[PDB]
Every structure is written in C-alpha cells, then in structure tokens.
UniProtKB/Swiss-Prot annotation:
It comes from the Bacteria. This is Arsenate reductase. It holds the Pfam family LMWPc. Its main location: cytoplasm. The gene is arsC. Potassium binding stabilizes the enzyme and increases its specific activity. Activity is also stimulated by sulfate. Inhibited by arsenite (mixed inhibitor). Catalyzes the reduction of arsenate [As(V)] to arsenite [As(III)]. In vitro, also has low phosphatase activity with para-nitrophenyl phosphate (pNPP) as substrate. Disruption phenotype: Deletion of the gene leads to a complete loss of arsenate resistance, but does not affect arsenite or antimony resistance. Transmembrane segments: none annotated. The lineage of its organism: Bacteria, Bacillati, Bacillota, Bacilli, Bacillales. Changing residue 123 to I: In strain: SW4, SW24 and SW1.
C-alpha cells in the first residue's frame, strides 16, 4: 500500500500547523506523507521552532505555505486546527475526509503556551495513529 496523505491546515501556517507537521513526520512517517498550510502565511513562529527544539525536532527547515489545490485533491485526510481554517477551508473533493482538531492559538503568549499546545498536538497525533 502507498503512503496516505494528511494535510494540516491553520490560520497562518506558523505555529499549530507547523508543530503538527513536525510531530506528524516523526509519528506518522511510516505510513503517511505530511503537509501543512494556512489561510495566510506568517512564516514559522520563532517560539514554535524553540518548542520543537526542546523535543529534539527541527522545524526551522519548514516553509509557511498557502493551501494548495493539488495537495487537497490527493489528501486522504484534511485536519483543520482552528475556526478560521475550518470555516475558510476551500471546498474539498467529494471523497476527501475532513476533521477538526481545535487547538488554542499560542501567538503573543509565553514560551509555556507553545509547550502546552505542542504537547496537546502530540497526543492527538499519537492517538490518531492508533485508531
Ligand atoms: K508547510
């Protein structure tokens, strides 16, 4: 069986979706291709990079990207991480499944908020893998 595709979408492909891609690559790497995008691109949040560094994952090489139609069409699962993404997610192909795993926006907050969200995302992806 060929690897499946999971697409994490958020508001600015800066924190939540970047950490989800980071965790996804490691946790789901054997059976999935992992991508992330945002309704807008704010670049990779510095605190999100620091947060992943604490768990020995480098996401400073990630890119902040807008939603790509080609990736959507080939996605097995699209996961929206916030209301903005969920409400503004472009129309998906009829056969593509979509789920909303909401996480708080750590933007403008202390280091600790990124640590908290980082780990809530980790748990969600770990559970997903064991479905
Ligand atoms: K990306």
């Amino acid at each position: 069986m060929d690897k499946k595709t999971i697409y994490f979408i958020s508001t600015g492909n800066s924190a939540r979706s970047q950490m989800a891609e980071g965790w996804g690559k490691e946790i789901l790497g054997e059976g999935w291709n992992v991508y992330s995008a945002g309704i807008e691109t704010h670049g990779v949040n510095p605190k999100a990079i620091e947060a992943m560094k604490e768990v020995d994952i480098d996401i400073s090489n990630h890119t902040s990207d807008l939603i790509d139609n080609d990736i959507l069409k080939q996605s097995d699962l699209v996961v929206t991480l916030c209301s903005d993404a969920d409400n503004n997610c472009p129309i998906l192909p009829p056969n593509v499944k979509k789920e909303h795993w909401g996480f708080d926006d750590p933007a403008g907050k202390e280091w600790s908020e990124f640590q908290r969200v980082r780990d809530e995302i980790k748990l969600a992806i770990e559970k997903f893998k064991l479905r």
